Amino acid sequence: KRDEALFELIALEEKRQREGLELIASENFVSKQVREAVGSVLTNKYAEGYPGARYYGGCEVIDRVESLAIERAKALFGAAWANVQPHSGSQANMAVYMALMEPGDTLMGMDLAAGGHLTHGSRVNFSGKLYKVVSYGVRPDTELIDLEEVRRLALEHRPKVIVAGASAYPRFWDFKAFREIADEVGAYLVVDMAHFAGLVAAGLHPNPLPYAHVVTSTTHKTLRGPRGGLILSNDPELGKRIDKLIFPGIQGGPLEHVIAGKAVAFFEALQPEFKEYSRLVVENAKRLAEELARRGYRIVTGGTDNHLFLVDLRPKGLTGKEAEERLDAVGITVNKNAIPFDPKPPRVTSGIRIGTPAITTRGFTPEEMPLVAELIDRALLEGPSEALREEVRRLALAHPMP
Amino acid sequence: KRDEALFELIALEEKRQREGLELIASENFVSKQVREAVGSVLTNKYAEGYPGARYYGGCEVIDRVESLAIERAKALFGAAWANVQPHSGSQANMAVYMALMEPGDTLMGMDLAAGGHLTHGSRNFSGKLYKVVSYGVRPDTELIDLEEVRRLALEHRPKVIVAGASAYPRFWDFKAFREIADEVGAYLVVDMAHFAGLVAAGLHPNPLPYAHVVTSTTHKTLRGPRGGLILSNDPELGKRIDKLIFPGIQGGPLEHVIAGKAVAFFEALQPEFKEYSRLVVENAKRLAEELARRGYRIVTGGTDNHLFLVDLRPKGLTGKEAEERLDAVGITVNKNAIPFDPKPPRVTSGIRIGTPAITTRGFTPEEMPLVAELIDRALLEGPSEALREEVRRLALAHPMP
Ligand SMILES: Nc1nc2c(c(=O)[nH]1)N(C=O)[C@@H](CNc1ccc(C(=O)N[C@@H](CCC(=O)O)C(=O)O)cc1)CN2
Missing domain, CATH: 3.40.640.10 (Type I PLP-dependent aspartate aminotransferase-like (Major domain))
Structure with missing residues (x-):
């Protein structure tokens, strides 16, 4: 007998991965x-x-x-x-x-x-x-x-x-x-x-x-x-x-x-394509950080030299946990994250961490970052809404998965 | 671009698994x-x-x-x-x-x-x-x-x-x-x-x-x-x-x-697992009996589970020697010390054999005498092409999951 219940779940996780924007810095998508x-x-x-x-x-x-x-x-x-x-x-x-x-x-x-x-x-x-x-x-x-x-x-x-x-x-x-x-x-x-x-x-x-x-x-x-x-x-x-x-x-x-x-x-x-991929990962991170900064978000250290960055949400009156929940509700996955001198415990935190390796594997380019930035900003200010979820879904679906 | 070198090795491993008899007690073959x-x-x-x-x-x-x-x-x-x-x-x-x-x-x-x-x-x-x-x-x-x-x-x-x-x-x-x-x-x-x-x-x-x-x-x-x-x-x-x-x-x-x-x-959790497990134990007991009748001594005189220990002293072999000879013909086991072995641990006087893996490939108790004979011949006669082919064929006749 095939374990249908389990495989039905795996199919649900595949769908979730395809239809959302995985912005967790420590994740990525492995090849077939x-x-x-x-x-x-x-x-x-x-x-x-x-x-x-x-x-x-x-x-x-x-x-x-x-x-x-x-x-x-x-x-x-x-x-x-x-x-x-x-x-x-x-x-x-x-x-x-x-x-x-x-x-x-x-x-x-x-x-x-x-x-x-x-x-x-x-x-x-x-x-x-x-x-x-x-x-x-x-x-x-x-x-x-x-x-x-x-x-x-x-x-x-x-x-x-x-x-x-x-x-x-x-x-x-x-x-x-x-x-x-x-x-x-x-x-x-x-x-x-x-x-x-x-x-x-x-x-x-x-x-x-x-x-x-x-x-x-x-x-x-x-x-x-x-x-x-x-x-x-x-x-x-x-x-x-x-x-x-x-x-x-x-x-x-x-x-x-x-x-x-x-x-x-x-x-x-070891293939040359990996160098091009990696170069894009970094350009996406820098651009996306700049886009959020232009929208009033405070970026730790003011930017980044690598694939990730931190957002100090204190001036916004949001805890990292709250932000992670709101973003998740519309298909944008990140993780609440401690920031230097965080007055809050790791279970709550005062910020969120964002990374670009995963979306870069899916073909996202620097020119698309202004759009990803707008979606994030709206979810944090306006809160979740069905129309917002749908925008994310279509954006994500316009990109292939390995 | 596919990593052909790596995938070529994977194909050889599949071939090796199909064509041998895995008797290492800790091994098994998982389902697709x-x-x-x-x-x-x-x-x-x-x-x-x-x-x-x-x-x-x-x-x-x-x-x-x-x-x-x-x-x-x-x-x-x-x-x-x-x-x-x-x-x-x-x-x-x-x-x-x-x-x-x-x-x-x-x-x-x-x-x-x-x-x-x-x-x-x-x-x-x-x-x-x-x-x-x-x-x-x-x-x-x-x-x-x-x-x-x-x-x-x-x-x-x-x-x-x-x-x-x-x-x-x-x-x-x-x-x-x-x-x-x-x-x-x-x-x-x-x-x-x-x-x-x-x-x-x-x-x-x-x-x-x-x-x-x-x-x-x-x-x-x-x-x-x-x-x-x-x-x-x-x-x-x-x-x-x-x-x-x-x-x-x-x-x-x-x-x-x-x-x-x-x-x-x-x-x-399916009833078939209980059937599979019953056969694992039956094959272990039967295989141990068959080797005993062929002149090997079983530690504790038998087993209650999926594995047993073979005392090779009656045939003047060490666990290291037997491991090599069996391995040379596609039968994998591992050396194991017997209670108060007169030989050092790197050598030993026994081997450990387990049946979970072969039971998964469909071996039944009525087939154990034949597996016993092959093990005995490899230990007494040593490795040869003819013996390796007999092992190969018997293995291929028992499919993998
Ligand atoms: N800077 C940093 N960020 C990170 C990690 C890390 O190790 N360091 N992580 C690494 O993967 C993840 C978060 N994982 C963590 C898990 C547990 C605790 C921790 O200290 N837990 C305590 C107290 C929790 C509380 O009640 O506030 C505990 O479990 O008792 C911290 C981070 C993602 N971001």
Whole structure:
């Protein structure tokens, strides 16, 4: 028997994805071939270990698949070593921390409201429960990272690991400076490029490989690959320790169907079309931010250098939660998001985050941003209305889906 | 532009799966509809949080998918709470350990050499964050000794005691384990990953009423997609573990895999699953008997579940040797230590064999004698082309899902 109820739901999610404007910065739309690989029979094989060194037999073919994913990741980012087994970006960070630190050590990361990820030291996350956390933020005036403040904290606290990279920071990172700061205190520099990995691959964002000791990332998000993790390093010696922490350290059998999909995504990222795609992602973000700014919205840092931006809704008397609900009601999906110095808890927040990777995959161009800006503005001021939902639906339907 | 190199490898893997006999106890072959769900667009959605309380908009449909998975799991296993977000069995155990213990606490679990799993105390995150005490089997019975388990518990006062393993061919007395746990004020955690499908089909004692928490994989005997699962009869304890899965140890859940889990639970709720599971056990018992008659010794003298352990000593072979010879002819098994093996762990004197996968391809008990003969010939005669072709043909005569 076919599970009709379940598949009817999947069809409903397909429709929702086609008929709305997905503006969540961490989402995107994977290609048909990525999905073909992820839905392959590769899930039927237990492949604990690494290529040429597995616990079970019958991995002769699987070894070529994983190896291909490894080599493509190295060539794409210019890394001497890679591990494509992490189940998620979260597991990638966990393995790295457990390999460089012992519980109780000091971890230095970006404050959450300022843009850091949960795995960068949040008290409700394993990162903040197992290690002592020292957080750095942004300046209250420009909302940018102040490198001297970072330096001062490092000298004072002497962390074992410093983490650069974020979930909601709209500007470039000076990796060279962060490494110098790390060297001054004998710390490891870990760069979590999850959000901007694709921009790095396309040459549109500084590359952390030469400066960080280790780089973690997701294969999904700007890289537009399957949902999973990835680790890179230019130090293969450090790479060997980390390999041991991924397995048998924190994971069991890897998801080889997903790793096959990672190989495909890397293949897609090496094609010239990916550079054009990535260039458009950025142009869309900047243009859309400018359009909202021209409508009276306050943009954190005043703009963006990447694929996302934050909107401080305080002057509008709206909480991020309220805005997310109103926009959602008319087919425009975003996420409530903390902004630097947010007086509200993460469940409410004082802003919303917007990103363009997903709509850019659907063919949206900078010239269409003024229209997307108008729709957002109306939904926040006039509230939801059936006529507004219908406008969004038609706009979205005028664009193909992979 | 299609990634031809990658897809060429996928085709070879399909061919390899069709043309061999998979006897690794932890393997299985999922249905096409489970694969259809996993290969769906649900992978595009970020859905952190739980149904009705997410950190992103647009989750209306996803919530219905995850709630369906949750409810079906509760109905299948008879549980009051469930969490379907764990990426794997290892993440499931990790979250439970972190919800019940603090680093430094004592964890008691079955020894790796005796059948326990890496996440049950291996000097693995389990053995790095916590103080471990292991229990094994008796050399004379080849079975767990509840009195040794009780002594160890009283002596070491563990905070958590784990029941379940990856290579134990007999039933577990969950009630006895719970008495032991209560006596020292410990939590009883049962990891049923291996035999979850048998539990779902009512062919194995259900641990839900006795354990405080139950973890499992969604693959293996449950024949679902690769992922993890947590169950319990205590919703309060459940709320605590939900917090450890997220935002504790994971980020975004794999909703396409969750949809795949919902499908598997649907399959397991149909009467045909009970028929399939009955045959799994019948094939394991029959295959063990046939190998015994051919001069191999079965640890514990048989099995109560889907797997059994083969003592190769009577034929002067090591587990490493047998693994290679079988692998050379398309038969995959894995080496396993026997109780108090006279050989080191990298070598061993036995192998583990499981029937879930071949039962899924339609093998029946009347065919086990033939599978037994092929295994025996490969071990005695060694690999050859003629033997490889016999295996190939027999496999091709049994279609995949
Ligand atoms: N800057 C930033 N933005 C982000 C993330 C992040 O990690 N950092 N996210 C990462 O994916 C998403 C939001 N996820 C989050 C989930 C939980 C909590 C949190 O601290 N929860 C607490 C308290 C909640 C309350 O009551 O206010 C808890 O669960 O106890 C924060 C962010 C999207 N945007």
